[PDB]
Design a protein around this ligand. Structure first.
Ligand SMILES: Cc1nc2ccc(Br)cc2c(-c2ccc(Cl)cc2)c1[C@H](OC(C)(C)C)C(=O)O
Ligand SMILES: Cc1nc2ccc(Br)cc2c(-c2ccc(Cl)cc2)c1[C@H](OC(C)(C)C)C(=O)O
Ligand SMILES: [As]
Ligand SMILES: [As]
Ligand SMILES: [As]
Ligand SMILES: [As]
Lengths: 144, 144
């Protein structure tokens, strides 16, 4: 399906804390970080992080105002990301499911989150690669 | 050259702050994070993060005592990482070079670091893919 450089970025709340969640839409691969609160500075920094790892062409979000900080515009600018003016899923419900199941295993919400991300990116499809294998396949295919 | 699941993990110091630096040895691709101080908890958490993203088989370090926390052993255990009992470069000098050059562009050391990581992972070889393209090629090739 989708162009290999599109990502979706959003925040959920759990335990009084904010989770920032990136989804590479063609694969389903997520990365995620617990931040103390939703600020433009946290978003910018996460985008900077994401961009030096993957080819990030455009990012979409379900709250466009997330992206209005100058901080955030500065990060998109410097790393050459364009915003998605062009899409009018839920992993957030599912990753939240996975978090709920491991929460036991860890003291800090952040550990549970990364544990949940690990499980998600590694599960093979109901029948069939894993999100982790898919993102890498898609992005390599788009190289060679 | 090297097995696609080997990583090197180490810390450098700059500005009174600790930088944790992961290097995928077959590609030269790095990821990096500024942490407030070198603790076993920071290392564990970074490994958890790294492992849900890439297939991480073994990790090496230039300071084996970094890896003796139970916290750290717990993270390697849960994510199935083995430590490298089997290697007797410098990117640290080079990434530090790249940091020194961009430091100007940012207030916080952390931003400069991610900016430096971005530049590193994206530069094409002197003649020739980039570290970013290489890691993805290696890891996809080892899938199919
Ligand atoms: C604070 C902590 N203390 C521990 C003490 C003993 C053991 Br065995 C594990 C942990 C883990 C622990 C839990 C799970 C895993 Cl996979 C690895 C370590 C944590 C976790 O925090 C990090 C990862 C930041 C150190 C946690 O939140 O529980
Ligand atoms: C605090 C800060 N304030 C700013 C104010 C105006 C503008 Br234009 C950029 C920044 C940037 C800034 C600098 C570089 C880039 Cl690439 C993007 C934003 C930062 C950076 O911090 C992060 C990334 C955490 C927000 C920084 O350390 O300078
Ligand atoms: As957000
Ligand atoms: As943007
Ligand atoms: As370290
Ligand atoms: As280990």
């Amino acid at each position: 399906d989708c162009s290999p450089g599109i990502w979706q970025l959003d925040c959920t709340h759990l335990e009084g804390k904010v989770i920032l969640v990136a989804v590479h839409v063609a694969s389903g691969y997520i990365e995620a970080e617990v931040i103390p609160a939703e600020t433009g500075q946290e978003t910018a920094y996460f985008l900077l992080k994401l961009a030096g790892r993957w080819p990030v062409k455009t990012v979409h979000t379900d709250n466009g105002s997330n992206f209005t900080s100058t901080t955030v515009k500065a990060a998109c600018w410097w790393a050459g990301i364009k915003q998605e003016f062009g899409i009018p899923e839920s992993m957030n419900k599912e990753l939240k499911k996975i978090i709920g199941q491991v929460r036991d295993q860890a003291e800090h919400l952040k550990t549970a989150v990364q544990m949940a991300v690990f499980i998600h990116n590694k599960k093979r499809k109901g029948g069939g690669y894993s999100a982790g294998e898919r993102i890498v396949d898609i992005i390599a295919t788009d190289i060679q």
